[PDB]
Amino acid sequence: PMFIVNTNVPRASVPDGFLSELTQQLAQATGKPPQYIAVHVVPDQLMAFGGSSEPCALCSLHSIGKIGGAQNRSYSKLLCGLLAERLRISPDRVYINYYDMNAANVGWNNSTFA
Amino acid sequence: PMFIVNTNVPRASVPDGFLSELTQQLAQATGKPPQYIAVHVVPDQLMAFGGSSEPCALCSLHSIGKIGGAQNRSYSKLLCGLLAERLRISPDRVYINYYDMNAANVGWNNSTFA
Amino acid sequence: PMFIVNTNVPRASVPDGFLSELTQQLAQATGKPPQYIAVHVVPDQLMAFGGSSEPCALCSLHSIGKIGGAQNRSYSKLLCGLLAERLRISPDRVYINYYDMNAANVGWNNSTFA
Ligand SMILES: CC(=O)Nc1ccc(O)c(-c2cc(NC(C)=O)ccc2O)c1
Ligand SMILES: [Cl-]
Ligand SMILES: [Cl-]
Ligand SMILES: [Cl-]
Ligand SMILES: [Cl-]
Ligand SMILES: [Cl-]
Ligand SMILES: [Cl-]
Ligand SMILES: [Cl-]
Ligand SMILES: [Cl-]
Ligand SMILES: [Cl-]
């Protein structure tokens, strides 16, 4: 799985180990080994939510399976919780797009997962 | 909805009112409330279009509904126009991927829109 | 078609001409005209893969057609190869999400490909 967070908060706002926290929490949440989890955080972005340049974030979670209505709500609660606590971004200013990828459409190590 | 623009033009070439104009124009075109439109512009990127590096842009518009044949054609004309007018990016060096998101796959405020 | 590479490797480590290179190779691989191929490389990113911060990359290949079971296995072999050789990123630390786009959902030059 891979989780990407794009945000306008400054780099200094991202605590050391934040990437590791995301990795471990997502492993726990998705059930997949942390070793398969990739995380990417992009601060100091030029973005707005509702026209407002106050702190916000646009994210995406891609995963082969383990993506569904109820599961996504749980992921959102977890992820929004982390962003609020660690980056001080209000949950109502956070979007996370979820993607349930077919194993044939995810490349890794010279091949796919199909 | 959410609109992202990745471009190689210098940050100083991006008008300060661009995120606001994109927000207003997208509200106007999609019919979606502006308070829920998120916009993100990422300048100074290392990109190529057709193998060359003159100004170009790769974008994506994610929306729960309001995505389709005719709508996408109108958005493309609207957005290419704005990119040409404000960033001097030729329409022929712009790609816009449209995504009709299921509400269940859009996280926000500790939940989803479904 | 468009190919995007996000990596934590330094900008200085991205070889000169790498984008034009990718354009040519993707042209042959997909069979599409170079004029329609867009490439985007994002170095110096804050990311982790498997909880490790060693060189890694998260990539996307979007195309109208030319996406499938064996085609994606072949693209993976090729792209992981070029990344390994040119950016020195190990293939076990690279993910590539493949997207088969409907022509109606791809905007370009004030219109769509529908
Ligand atoms: C040796 C071994 O058992 N590894 C393992 C363990 C638990 C899993 O859930 C998967 C697993 C991993 C993926 N790979 C990705 C990227 O999700 C997909 C489906 C899976 O069941 C793989
Ligand atoms: Cl970190
Ligand atoms: Cl579910
Ligand atoms: Cl898929
Ligand atoms: Cl408002
Ligand atoms: Cl550069
Ligand atoms: Cl339509
Ligand atoms: Cl969706
Ligand atoms: Cl195939
Ligand atoms: Cl599509």
CA dihedral of residues C8, C93, C76, C102 (deg, nearest 10): -60
Please say whether the beta carbons of A1 and A36 come within 8 A: yes
- Domain of C23? 1-114
Pick the closest to residue A64 from A21, A25, A96, A108 (CA basis): A108
Determine the distance from the C-alpha atom of residue C22 to the mean position of all C-alpha atoms in its chain, rounded to a whole number: 8
- Residue A24, token pair as written in the block: 């471990």
β-bridge pairing C111-112 and B2-7: unpaired
Radius of gyration of chain C (CA): 14
Q: Any idea which ligand is nearest the CA of A75?
A: 3
Ligand 1 atom with the shortest distance to the CA of A108: 16
CATH number at residue C70: 3.30.429.10
Look-up: residue for tokens 């998101």?
B101
The number of CA neighbours under 13 Å toward the Cβ of B75 is: 30
Please name the residue that has the structure tokens 């190869």: C81
- Residues surrounding ion ligand 3 at CB below 5 Å: A 68-71
CB A94 within 8 A of CB A56: yes
Contact C107 B45 (CB under 8 A): no
Strand C111-112 relative to strand A106-108: parallel, antiparallel, unpaired? unpaired
* Run of H or E residues at C73: helix C69-87
Number of domains in chain B: 1
**Under an 8 A CB cutoff, do C49 and A42 touch?**
no
Residue C102 Cα, ligand 6 centroid: separation in angstroms?
Answer: 32
The method of structure determination was X-ray
Strand partners, A48: B39
Neighbours of chain B (3+ CB pairs under 8 A): A, C
Cα atoms found within 13 Å of the Cα of residue B60, Cβ hemisphere only: 11
- Which of A99, A82, B76 minimizes the C-alpha distance to C110? B76
Tell me how long chain B is.
Answer: 114
